[PDB]
Amino acid sequence: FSSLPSYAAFATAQEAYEQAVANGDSEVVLKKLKKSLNVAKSEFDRDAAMQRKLEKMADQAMTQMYKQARSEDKRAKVTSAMQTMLFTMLRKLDNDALNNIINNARDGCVPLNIIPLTTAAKLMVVIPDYNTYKNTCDGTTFTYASALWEIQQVVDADSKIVQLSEISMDNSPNLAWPLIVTALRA
Amino acid sequence: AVGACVLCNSQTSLRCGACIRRPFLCCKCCYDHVISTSHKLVLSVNPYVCNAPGCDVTDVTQLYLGGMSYYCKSHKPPISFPLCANGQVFGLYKNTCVGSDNVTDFNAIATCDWTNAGDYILANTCTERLKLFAAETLKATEETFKLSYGIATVREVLSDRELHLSWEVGKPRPPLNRNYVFTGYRVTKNSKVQIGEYTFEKGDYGDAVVYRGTTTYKLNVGDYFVLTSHTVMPLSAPTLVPQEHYVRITGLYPTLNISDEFSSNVANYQKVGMQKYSTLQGPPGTGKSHFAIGLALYYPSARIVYTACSHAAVDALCEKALKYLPIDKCSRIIPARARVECFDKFKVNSTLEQYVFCTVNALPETTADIVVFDEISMATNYDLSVVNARLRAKHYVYIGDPAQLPAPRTLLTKGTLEPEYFNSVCRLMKTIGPDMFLGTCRRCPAEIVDTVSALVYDNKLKAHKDKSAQCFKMFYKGVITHDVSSAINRPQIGVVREFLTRNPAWRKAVFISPYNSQNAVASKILGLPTQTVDSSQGSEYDYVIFTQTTETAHSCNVNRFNVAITRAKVGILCIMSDRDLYDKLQFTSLEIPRRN
Amino acid sequence: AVGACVLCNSQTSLRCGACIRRPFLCCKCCYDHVISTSHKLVLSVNPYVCNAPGCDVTDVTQLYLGGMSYYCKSHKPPISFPLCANGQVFGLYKNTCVGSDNVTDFNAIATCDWTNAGDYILANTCTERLKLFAAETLKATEETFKLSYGIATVREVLSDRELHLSWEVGKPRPPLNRNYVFTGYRVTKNSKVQIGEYTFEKGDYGDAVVYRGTTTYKLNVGDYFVLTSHTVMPLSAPTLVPQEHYVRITGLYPTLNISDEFSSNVANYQKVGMQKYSTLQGPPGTGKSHFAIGLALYYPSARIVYTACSHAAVDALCEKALKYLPIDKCSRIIPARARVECFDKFKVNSTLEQYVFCTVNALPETTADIVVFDEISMATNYDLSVVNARLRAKHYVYIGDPAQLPAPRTLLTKGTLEPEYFNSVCRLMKTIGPDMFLGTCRRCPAEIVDTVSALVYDNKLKAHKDKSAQCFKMFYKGVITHDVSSAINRPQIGVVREFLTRNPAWRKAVFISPYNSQNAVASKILGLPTQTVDSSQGSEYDYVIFTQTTETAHSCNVNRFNVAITRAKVGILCIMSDRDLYDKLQFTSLEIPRRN
RNA sequence: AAUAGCUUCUUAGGAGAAUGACGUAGCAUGCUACGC
RNA sequence: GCGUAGCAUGCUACGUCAUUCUCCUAAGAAGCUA
């Protein structure tokens, strides 16, 4: 604001006007100095308002640029995350048996549920009671979905281990049911 | 899109799209680059072009930021301030931009063309970021130069190895050369398929050329061939890691004693443990790859990588390497490429064994203890940074001798390039030496090592089996009987017309000559096959009849002379004007009209 | 950003910037700290400096609260208020702080430089909160003094473990012992960077030293070693838990008759279970820690923790515990520290073992039934606060003797501290009574304890196992080759020459010496490993070898002689200038060549 | 740690309107110095 | 009768400052209903 050309002209105009008033000449110089300071303050209002607009305009633009950069950064990061998860998921599936059954299918279309139902190598039974235990997965091997599995670890609800001996009709209450028992295809 | 200025490293969002590579520039730095050159377009996180429809002005110096976009001086709204002011163009972090005044050499890079020697000498003598940026830029220029070329239509397909391929109409034919690997195509009508990659060679005559292919899916007469290309990838890693010596073997667990014939090398093998990375100069004929595989054996409990540039170099590497190594090995480079047949021993993707042999341009993401890089008098800035980017090992050694030749690098046409300025590693190998020198050669005759150590070497390498019959019959060169732009020195060949009979035990010798046409016209009236050193550096012979050419500096390059003399077992003859060179090599000089 | 008045416990929002630790001060309390002490930097939620650019009036007495921002008198806002007014300083909760008259003592503790016994003797007897504050500020002060001395550089490169050091001429040099480690900065120009941590050892000759670094870096000539910093965290928990009594035993369960060989202590084994905390004064060489293990048996399943100040002491006691307890015992002392090594038995971090043996520096924050600190004569109020803070148990028992050797207290160079004033626990041990007494020293040659009786003690101890073969050769103190300010009387070891082979069965003694470097010299021309008096105080040995130094004030401390001779079982000799002390020790001394 | 609707409160911004005051220009009227 | 000038007053336009109002946007904290 102070650096505007009107600033110095206005300041020295008011100064010399006060000087001439201390000289006490005829009022025509009073009218002249009034006119001078008037136009000076007019253009001063002009430039002051211009700078006031410029501040807000520049700040809006700058915060806008910050927002744009932020959006682009997050976007690139999320795309990388998605691609990574996709590829690390893919590189897991048992490609052999899957290739087998799909290429066996007459079109390349197979309903989804049978995909795990016939190519999974695991089985996470969940049991809510000793009775359904007795009647689904007794002993060390069992049969389900037309294939032969075998137990390998029986973790209870507290994420502890439970030796296959502990699960007995009289040893029901001490085991915090349900009983997440895994397995393995065989 | 926020990055680091290539000169000020302060966070910024400015790029010169007028520059082919678009590097990040701080405010003041881009100011200096944009005031001085013809680089007259700047792009922020959004382009700085007048938003007014029909206003196609580009440079920011005539632009004012208005409401929420930027306009030319014409369509500007009332409140609108210029984007260039106080040495700052409007962008992010204007108050934290530090900048500098190194604009000079940066501008030199931004304006050069890569067609003169001084360009390269600057490009290999500049700052680090400056170095890598020069690398990327020159590589892109050579990429578009390759792509500036075009097609080649098959006139006839003689055989799986002999070919009649006519080249594009009105086009400067890409020469008969190994590097340019040609991708082929056969359009059905309807989905032209890519028939693979193939390499060519100047055969026994014209027009028919010799060639090799990656696939046995045979070519046709309707196919057309261009050569292959890509897009240049950005780089981050430095050219070379800083030096680090050590007081002991930092985890290098050596062998006990086995293969004591490498005792001449264990003296250096200790030093490998003593330093972080270093160099070694093995002149052709020396214990290289013997040093290397003996080093592998000496430290047998550490993963090792080996690397070179071309398939020829990498198989020459893995050979003599399959020998001293239980196998139990890997050299796994290329799944679906390699115009010439390549590794045929093991898997594709398992990074199985501790020793792998590949090429820099094809390395996958691998970790190991040490990477041994031979062939370094050929490599340039780019491959070094790729190496640092892909292999974070515990040791490194650059193997090789700068006395060999540089790359084709076709764009150099005003001057020549010196080894001390080939690239950084050779600059070190010449400004301080290899720091580790290997002696000595064994294969070549001593008469061609001690006599040739007088030139660029410092008389430090030796050999044996001096005999026999190696003399230089200096013929006074004739006029330039050039058919093609390169000379045909048949007057020089005018010394062999009375020679096919006077060499009793020399019939399977090798005519070699620098000009490809000097091999072709000789192959027309020929008695023995020609192979210039470009296909050599990987090929050995017993005799050789090297024929020089016009007295231009091309023929009398001492580096090419060394690489063309040190490729024989028993025999060599030199035929040149040779006012001074035959004074540094000492044999019985002979004259042409005398048979003695 | 609130807290409690360190003197009045009201909420306050202020701190003294000039005071070293910047403690919270109530309003009037801060007024009094600032009125008559040169400290004038007071920090509120924001600092109190005048916010006028370029105005630096920093005395809080000369500022004014303006509107939103405080200022100086000249730059003051139109209307505002004076800050320091009516004996108060405008701070949050201005009206509701009480403020007290502990002003003089706090002023003293704040301004003092601790170089005279006033600070110790006063912190030993002041208010608990004030006590802890004095402890933290004394630690921080000595830490800041650590910064005063200078840097080390390299002078010449010789080998991997033989270097010549160069002290910055004109600054206090650091003592060459294991307790000093420095980071190695190398200045290229351009990468002034740390290389790793280093520790030194003065070898048999200067200026060569043998040293160890954490890394195997190759030491160049552009390297140097700068001391590594240390800080102090604030502590809140009490030092001495308020005493409590009962009429029954809770949390601990008695035993019937087990281990009758620990009989006499049961009468005190019960009162410990009856009270909240208690102490045992053990005269030198008494049945201390015997009582400890005996109570540990008496209450078997009661979880127990042992702690002390000396690593040698905690090692000795953990070994003695290994001697008689089920194991079933851990000493989680130190994983990767303790330059002089210790246990290699069991875990460091599992928090499962019943009887946890640990050191103050590595105490965890767990619970237990009973914890026992040991050797109270060395630890300080700070250490007391740590050991009371990290743990929490039912009953507390401390065992020690005020007549042992206290902490170093380097800045203490004028005056002396009586046994009582080593810390608060020692104070209570020197109060109306140590409240539990057991005195008889049998692990020592009975004659030496009979002389210890004639020394500062009041002739009240008895023993067995008197004989034999003890004396004191008052050889004249030769030239002290004091590299460090610690003595080296090699001419005194200049008589050890006549005791290297002359002793047929006196071979596995342990050597004691007053100064650290006259122990180092016994570690230079070695006949057996030696230890200092600080490493002593807790172990007894069959024979003892002792070469003293000049009559310096540090040497002639009778308590040191006690804690030295009390480490004997059957043998001892002394080599002291000894103008008078030989008339005090009652044995059969001889001369140099009279050893038959 | 969901979809949707309503409502109380706080801040910033914009826009608009009213009001009052200051200053510049122009328009109208009057009084008067001067000139014809 | 005219103009220059000055003063005073009314009107219009513009450009500043303050008060209020209105609406719209944005952002945030809390509640209720299906």
Ligand SMILES: Nc1ncnc2c1ncn2[C@@H]1O[C@H](COP(=O)(O)OP(=O)(O)O)[C@@H](O)[C@H]1O
């Ligand atoms: N100590 C040695 N004794 C015999 N031959 C050796 C010895 N060292 C190296 N060589 C031989 O040199 C020959 C290969 O040299 P080469 O590897 O062709 O040279 P360069 O590797 O420098 O290009 C091999 O026959 C190799 O055994």
Ligand SMILES: Nc1ncnc2c1ncn2[C@@H]1O[C@H](COP(=O)(O)OP(=O)(O)O)[C@@H](O)[C@H]1O
């Ligand atoms: N009741 C006891 N019977 C036999 N020896 C005892 C008895 N009490 C303590 N001691 C012995 O005192 C010796 C150790 O004393 P020490 O612990 O060296 O003294 P101090 O601990 O005071 O420095 C040990 O051999 C220990 O058994």
Ligand SMILES: [Mg+2]
């Ligand atoms: Mg080799």
Ligand SMILES: [Mg+2]
């Ligand atoms: Mg003890």
Ligand SMILES: [Zn+2]
């Ligand atoms: Zn910059």
Ligand SMILES: [Zn+2]
């Ligand atoms: Zn540019």
Ligand SMILES: [Zn+2]
């Ligand atoms: Zn425009």
Ligand SMILES: [Zn+2]
């Ligand atoms: Zn107080």
Ligand SMILES: [Zn+2]
């Ligand atoms: Zn203070």
Ligand SMILES: [Zn+2]
């Ligand atoms: Zn001020």
